[PDB]
Enzyme design. Structure first.
Site, mmCIF file in Angstrom:
data_model
loop_
_atom_site.group_PDB
_atom_site.id
_atom_site.type_symbol
_atom_site.label_atom_id
_atom_site.label_comp_id
_atom_site.label_asym_id
_atom_site.label_seq_id
_atom_site.Cartn_x
_atom_site.Cartn_y
_atom_site.Cartn_z
ATOM 1 N N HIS A 16 0.784 -1.249 0.000
ATOM 2 C CA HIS A 16 0.000 0.000 0.000
ATOM 3 C C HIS A 16 0.811 1.293 0.000
ATOM 4 C CE1 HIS A 16 -3.456 -2.525 0.482
ATOM 5 N NE2 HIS A 16 -3.007 -2.990 1.634
ATOM 6 N N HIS A 130 -2.998 -3.355 8.196
ATOM 7 C CA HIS A 130 -4.106 -3.673 7.302
ATOM 8 C C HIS A 130 -4.765 -2.396 6.834
ATOM 9 C CE1 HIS A 130 -7.757 -5.632 5.825
ATOM 10 N NE2 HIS A 130 -8.471 -4.875 6.633
HETATM 11 N N1 LIG Z 1 1.119 -16.004 5.628
HETATM 12 C C1 LIG Z 1 -0.153 -15.717 5.860
HETATM 13 C C2 LIG Z 1 -0.755 -16.076 7.073
HETATM 14 C C3 LIG Z 1 -2.099 -15.755 7.264
HETATM 15 N N2 LIG Z 1 -2.806 -15.075 6.240
HETATM 16 C C4 LIG Z 1 -4.233 -14.753 6.428
HETATM 17 C C5 LIG Z 1 -4.384 -13.277 6.819
HETATM 18 C C6 LIG Z 1 -4.823 -12.299 6.033
HETATM 19 N N3 LIG Z 1 -4.799 -11.183 6.773
HETATM 20 C C7 LIG Z 1 -5.191 -9.806 6.380
HETATM 21 C C8 LIG Z 1 -6.457 -9.345 7.102
HETATM 22 O O1 LIG Z 1 -7.336 -10.444 7.431
HETATM 23 C C9 LIG Z 1 -5.891 -8.737 8.382
HETATM 24 N N4 LIG Z 1 -6.825 -7.833 9.145
HETATM 25 C C10 LIG Z 1 -8.065 -7.486 8.827
HETATM 26 N N5 LIG Z 1 -8.532 -6.695 9.780
HETATM 27 C C11 LIG Z 1 -7.599 -6.529 10.724
HETATM 28 C C12 LIG Z 1 -7.530 -5.856 11.906
HETATM 29 N N6 LIG Z 1 -8.565 -5.126 12.380
HETATM 30 N N7 LIG Z 1 -6.428 -5.895 12.665
HETATM 31 C C13 LIG Z 1 -5.323 -6.635 12.246
HETATM 32 N N8 LIG Z 1 -5.399 -7.308 11.043
HETATM 33 C C14 LIG Z 1 -6.532 -7.256 10.317
HETATM 34 O O2 LIG Z 1 -4.780 -7.993 7.940
HETATM 35 C C15 LIG Z 1 -4.146 -8.765 6.863
HETATM 36 C C16 LIG Z 1 -3.768 -7.651 5.914
HETATM 37 O O3 LIG Z 1 -4.783 -7.411 4.925
HETATM 38 N N9 LIG Z 1 -4.355 -11.507 7.998
HETATM 39 N N10 LIG Z 1 -4.107 -12.817 8.028
HETATM 40 C C17 LIG Z 1 -2.167 -14.754 5.089
HETATM 41 O O4 LIG Z 1 -2.760 -14.177 4.171
HETATM 42 N N11 LIG Z 1 -0.866 -15.077 4.909
#
Ligand SMILES: Nc1ccn(Cc2cn([C@H]3[C@@H](O)[C@H](n4cnc5c(N)ncnc54)O[C@@H]3CO)nn2)c(=O)n1
Length: 135
Positions: A16, A130
């Site tokens: 981003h 995020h």
């Molecule tokens: N290697 C890996 C391991 C796991 N994942 C799954 C994953 C995907 N995400 C995205 C959102 O679900 C997550 N996210 C959305 N809301 C919030 C929030 N409020 N506070 C913290 N984070 C948030 O931030 C990430 C960045 O877009 N997080 N985990 C992945 O894609 N790759």
């Protein structure tokens, strides 16, 4: 999605902030090569990482995408940004994906968290992880 060498903050910066070309098709190659798929939509904020960290210091608000999370923060002011939209898929050759580009000036909402203890630099204890919404 996220490659193992990046913290969530470094991934946020890669997706981003660090738009490596002003052209979406070229800039998106970085994200897509890392995640091994052409991302359908992606927003680059034309602001600095330090500015986004400052936004993490703005008042907490509920995240638009998740009514259970309170770690979101509104930018306060609008910034220039570029939205990239996939026009030409190419799942067997990620390099051939093409994008349209839409410039805009909008507010944003980011989720922030405490930094990765081992891997994020100590300079910024709180970091964006995020991009939740553009308004
Ligand atoms: N290697 C890996 C391991 C796991 N994942 C799954 C994953 C995907 N995400 C995205 C959102 O679900 C997550 N996210 C959305 N809301 C919030 C929030 N409020 N506070 C913290 N984070 C948030 O931030 C990430 C960045 O877009 N997080 N985990 C992945 O894609 N790759």
């Amino acid at each position: 999605m996220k490659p193992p060498q990046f913290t969530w903050a470094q991934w946020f910066e890669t997706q981003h902030i660090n738009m490596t070309s002003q052209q979406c098709t070229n800039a998106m190659q970085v994200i897509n090569n890392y995640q091994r798929r052409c991302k359908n939509q992606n927003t680059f904020l034309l602001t600095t990482f330090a500015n986004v960290v400052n936004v993490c210091g703005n008042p907490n608000m509920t995240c638009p995408s998740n009514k259970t999370r309170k770690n979101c923060h509104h930018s306060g002011s609008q910034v220039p940004l570029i939205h990239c939209n996939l026009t030409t898929p190419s799942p067997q050759n990620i390099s051939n994906c093409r994008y349209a580009q839409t410039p805009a000036n909008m507010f944003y909402i980011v989720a922030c968290d405490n930094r990765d203890q081992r891997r994020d630099p100590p300079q910024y204890p709180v970091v964006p992880v995020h991009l939740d919404r553009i308004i």
